[PDB]
Structure formats: C-alpha cells, structure tokens
Amino acid sequence: ELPTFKDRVPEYPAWFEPFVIQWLDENEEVSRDFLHGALERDKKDGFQQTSEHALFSCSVVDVFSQLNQSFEIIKKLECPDPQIVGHYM
C-alpha cells in the first residue's frame, strides 16, 4: 500500500520460485511413485470398475485426487507474478 510498491508487481515471488519448483519436483516424483502404487493396488484389485456405473477403476480417481491435492498446494501460493506462475504451470 505504500505508493512506491502499489506501483509494482511484487518481485518477492522470484525468490521463492526455485523452492516451489523443487517442491513441484519432489511432488512429481512422489506422484509418479504414488501412480505406480495406485495402478498396482488397482491391478491387485484385478481393475474392478469403481462401480458398475462408475466404469473406470479406482486408480484414476486416486491419481486425480493426488494431482488436485498437488495443484492446490501450488494454487495456494497465488503468485502475483503470472510468468513465475506460468513457469509453475
């Protein structure tokens, strides 16, 4: 709210961005290990449909759940630099 910085896109997100990318990295690898676990749990479940009308099996759901938990951790930063956001994206 000081005029000097109301005048500007905040530069501070450039500081954290590598740590967010690191987090995105830790996150992806965890997510890929999770993906294999989920596929394999579903495979062990013989790939049953999630119900007789939910025609896909549960790993799909688990994965989207994970991906959303993950995405929301990003989204919760609301980085005011949209190019740094673009980089996360």
Added chain:
Amino acid sequence: ELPTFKDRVPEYPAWFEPFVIQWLDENEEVSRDFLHGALERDKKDGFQQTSEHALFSCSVVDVFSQLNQSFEIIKKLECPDPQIVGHYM
C-alpha cells in the same frame, strides 16, 4: 551475398586492421597493468585458494577473464581475411 562480392575475400577488413592492431596493443598494456593489480590483490590476500576445489588463487581467474574478454572481442570480429586473422592471432 551479392555474386560480385561472394566472388571475393572482403576488402573492408584491410581498412580496419591498423585500428584492430592498435586496439590489440592497447589491450596488451591494459592486460599487463590489470595483471599487476590482480596479483597485488591476491598477494596481499596471501594467495588464498579461491575455494576448497578451486585450488588456485583469484589472480588466475582475473587474468584469464581479462584475456578472454580481450579474445572474444577479436573473435566477434570474425575477420573474413585469414591473413589479417593470422596477423591478429
């Protein structure tokens, strides 16, 4: 790219060569005076190794930086006369 001059080694570098030579000279003096500076810093610092893996002291880095700056200018001329280039070299 005009046929008339793709048919030649360009003559314009011969215009500038005396100036590039004068520049190489000036650059040598600047390099030798820079060197004594770089060494005097390093000597006064008691020749600290630059780091625990850069087993050499800073004056090396200074000097090669100066040389590399100097070289890169010449190299960016890309003088199309190999004899003028040989002379520069």
Added chain:
Amino acid sequence: VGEVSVHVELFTHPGTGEQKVTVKVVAANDLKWQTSGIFRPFIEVNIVGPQLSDKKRKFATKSKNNSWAPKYNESFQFSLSADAGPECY
C-alpha cells in the same frame, strides 16, 4: 571505470509487435573498485524512456564475491511501450 559485456536482443516481439528487450549481462571487466573490504559486484540494468510507470524498470544480476571481472551470463527482458519506438529508449 570498467566495462560491461552485454549481448542485447531487441525483439519487436515476434508474439505481439510490442518491443521487448532481452539483455544478456555476460560479464563486467576492469572495474576500478579495489575496495577497502569484500567487493561484491552486481549489475543493475535499467531501461529508460517514456511510458514505463506500469513496467519493471530495473533488473539486477546476482552478486559475485571479490571479482573485478565478474561473469554473470544473466538474461533480463524489459518491455518497452508499444507506442514509442526503440529510439525513444
């Protein structure tokens, strides 16, 4: 008091017909600053010209410890206005 190697690419931005100015800060050299302490040079780059109130006018390289010839290799990207030509900047 020294010199700065830059490589600069004006892009009459191939994506917009605005002008963007990429500035690769390669290095500095011959910095007349053999200081009474730890020298820690960094290079601020600023764009100057009309209609820049809404724009990031300033960048800086990282700093380099004890280095009168610090390399950077850091590439910045100013936006100019769309209206004012590059000769206004």
